[PDB]
Amino acid sequence: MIINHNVSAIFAHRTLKSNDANLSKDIEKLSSGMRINKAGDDASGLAVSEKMRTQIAGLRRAEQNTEDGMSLIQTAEGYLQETHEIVQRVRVLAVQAANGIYSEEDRQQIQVEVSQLVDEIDRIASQAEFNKMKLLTGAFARLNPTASMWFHIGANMHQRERVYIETMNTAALGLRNPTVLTFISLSTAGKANSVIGLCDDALRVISKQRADLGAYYNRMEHAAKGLMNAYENTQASESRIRDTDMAEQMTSFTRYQILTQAATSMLAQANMKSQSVMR
Template structure:
C-alpha cells in the first residue's frame, strides 16, 4: 500500500471530471433544444446549418416579396376594374346617343356625361399607385414601360417583372372628348349635332374595353404565376427547415437517455472517489 500516489482516487477523479462535463453538455443541449450550440460541437454541421438558415430566411422574405407583388397587381386591377365600369357606361351612352329619336338637347346631355367620364378615367390613371409606385400613368411614372421587378427568390437571379401599361383617355382613343377637334368648340358639341359621332364612339369604346381587358388578363396571369411561386417557395423553405433541423436540433429522447446515463456515471464516480480516498485511511492504523 502506497501513500504518495493514490491511483484509484486519481482515476476516479478523472472519470468524475469527464462525467461532469458530459452532464453539462447534455443539460445545455436539453435546455437549448440544439445539439450544435457552438462550432466545437460539430464544425461541419454548424457551417452547413448557417448556410441553410441564410437560405431559409431569404426564401421567407421572397415569399413576402411575392405577396407584395400580388397586392400591387390587385391594386392595379382594382383601378382597371373602375375604368372598365366607366367604359361600359360610355358604351351605353354612345349607343343611346346614336339613336335618332333623341333630341339635340338629349345628345348634348349625353355628351356632357361622356366628357366627365373621360376626365374620370384620367383621374383614376394618375391616382393609381401602390406604395408610391404609380401603376397606370406615364406622366406620374416615366419608367412605367420598364415594369416593376420583384425579387422572388433567395438568389440574385431569381426575379420576376410585373409589366405595367399606361391606361388613360389618350391610350384608349378617347382624348378627343376633351379637345376642340370636331364640329364646334369641342368634341361634345360635335356629338350633340348628330348621331354619326356616337356610332364612331361605340366602336372606339369597344376597342378601349378590349385594351383594358387585355391588360387585366396579363396582370391576372402574373398573379396566378405568383401563386405558384409562393407555393414552391413555401415548400422549399419547409424542406430546408427540416434538413437544418436534422443537423442542428436536439433529439430530446436520445439526449435524455444520455443525460440519465451520464448522471448515473457521475454519481458512481463520486462514490468511487470517496471510497478510494477512504482506503488510504487504513495506513493510519498501521502507525498506531
C-alpha cells in the first residue's frame, strides 16, 4: 500500500478547510446582527441598504427640521396676539373719543394712552425674534424682501418650501403715515370717528396674517406626520434587506460546527490508516 502520500487525508483536510470558512461567516452574522457585513455577501443588497440608511437619517433629520419650522411659525403667531389686543383697545377708545360730551382735555387724556399703545405696537414689531432673526420687520415679505425663509422638510436636494411674513408695524398697519411718520390721533371728535375705520382696516390685516401662519402651521403638521410614517416604512424596508434572522442563522451555525467535528474525526482516521501496512 502507498505510504509516500495519503490522498484520503488530503480530501478530508480540503473538506475541513472549506467548512471552517463557512463557520467564520456565520459567526460574523450572529455577532453583528446584520445579514451583509463585507462586500461580496450581497453587493446589490448592500448598495440598496446603504441608500436606505441615508434616507432614514435624512427623513429623521427632515422631521426635526419641520418641528423647528413649526416652532418659528408658532413663535411668530404669538407676537401678533399681543398686537391684536392693542388695536382692539385703540378701537374701543376711539368710539368713546368720538362722542360729543368730552372736551379737548379729555380727548388729550385719551391720546396719552393712544401714544403708548402705538409705541408698544412699534416695539413688538421691532423686537419679535426667533433665534436672533427679526420676523415682523419686513425681511421675509414677498414684494421687496431682504431675505427668504425656506424650510427643508425632505431628505433630498430640492425638497423645501417657502414661508412669507409681512411687515407688522404701525406704518404697515395704516396707523402711521409711511412718508411723514405722524400717526393717528384721537384728540378731536372728527379724527376719532375716522380712527374707528382705520382700526377696522388694521384688525383685518392682523387677522389675515394670523390666518396665513395658521395655514403654514397646519401644513407642517401634516408633513411631520407623513415624515414619521415614511421613516417607519423605510426602516422596515432596510431591516428586511440588511438584518439577519438570528433563529435561521443559528441553525446554519450549528450545521457547520458539526460538519467541522465530522471532518476532524475522519482526518484523524486517515492519518492512522497508513500505519496498517507497517506491520
